[PDB]
Amino acid sequence: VNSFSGYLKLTDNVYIKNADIVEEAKKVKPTVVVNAANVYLKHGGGVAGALNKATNNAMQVESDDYIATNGPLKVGGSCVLSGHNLAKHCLHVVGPNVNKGEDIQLLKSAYENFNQHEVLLAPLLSAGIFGADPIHSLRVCVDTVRTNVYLAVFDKNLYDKLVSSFL
Ligand SMILES: O=C(Nc1ccc(C(=O)N[C@H]2c3cccc(O)c3C[C@@H]2C(=O)O)cc1)NC1CC1
């Protein structure tokens, strides 16, 4: 049993809710919240910008030190950093950004990072300002992630479309 509330069950292991991932993280304090990161961990907008704002920029400060030491992530890769006031840990995962021409096949590799964590709160990777089709992202999620994932979809119209079109 876990504290995630109001989710629709899509499969054995994937759950979905119309919710602001920031507000959901603040309320559940999950072990892992996933950030929709870029390779530079520059949390300017979209989900990343929102999560970072909720940490009063502490996520960005920590991220800048990480990059200065380790260099950029790979598209499809991830790193575990602090969850600050939102979660125990933040898994920063880089999905391909279609508005940069990145290969959409890398989306499966990005979701594979979730399998290193038993339970996660997450957005749909490569959705929103990353330019991919969220219906496709949900399909890849379901077909790749085997651990227990609680997906937060900010837009109600999109949430309803994702549920109603789910096979
Ligand atoms: O701003 C906020 N929350 C806030 C929450 C989510 C987003 C956002 O863009 N999410 C989408 C995104 C962005 C980038 C890549 C992606 O794959 C996705 C899928 C995500 C989705 O479809 O849900 C933006 C803002 N809270 C403050 C207190 C009011």
Cβ-proximal residues to 143 (8 Å cutoff; 6+ apart), any chain: 108
For residue 63, which of 78, 42, 48, 93 has the smallest C-alpha distance?
Answer: 42
Q: How many H helices and E strands in the chain? A: 6, 7
Burial category of 111 from C-beta neighbours within 10 Å (exposed 0-12, middle 13-18, buried 19 and up): buried
User: Rounded CA gap, 62 and 58, in Å?
Assistant: 6
Q: Where are the domains of the chain?
A: 8-165
For residue 154, which of 71, 67, 51 has the smallest C-alpha distance?
Answer: 51
For residue 97, which of 124, 77, 126 has the smallest C-alpha distance?
Answer: 126
Ligand 1 centroid to Cα of residue 8, in Å, is 19
Q: Which experimental method was this entry solved with?
A: X-ray
User: Rounded CA gap, 160 and 135, in Å?
Assistant: 11
Ligand 1 centroid to Cα of residue 3, in Å, is 22
Residue 131, Cβ neighbours under 10 Å: how many? 16
Pocket test for ligand 1, best of 21, 133, 157, 162 (most atoms within 8 A of CB): 21
Q: What is the DSSP string of 93-156?
A: E----GGGT--TTHHHHHHHGGGGSSEEEEPPTT-GGG---HHHHHHHHHHH--SEEEEEES-H
Residue 95, Cβ neighbours under 10 Å: how many? 28
Give the three-state DSSP class for 36.
strand
Between helices 58-70 and 46-54, what is the axis angle to 10°?
A: 120
Phi, psi of 80 (to 5 degrees): -100, 120
**Is ligand 1 within 6 A of the CB of residue 107?**
no
The DSSP output letter for 7 is P
Which class in CATH covers the domain with range 8-165?
A: alpha beta
**Is ligand 1 within 6 A of the CB of residue 112?**
no
- Whether residue 127 contacts residue 134, with contact meaning beta carbons closer than 8 Å, is answered with yes
Phi, psi of 164 (to 5 degrees): -65, -25
- The pair of three-digit structure tokens given for residue 84, joined into one six-digit string: 């600050």
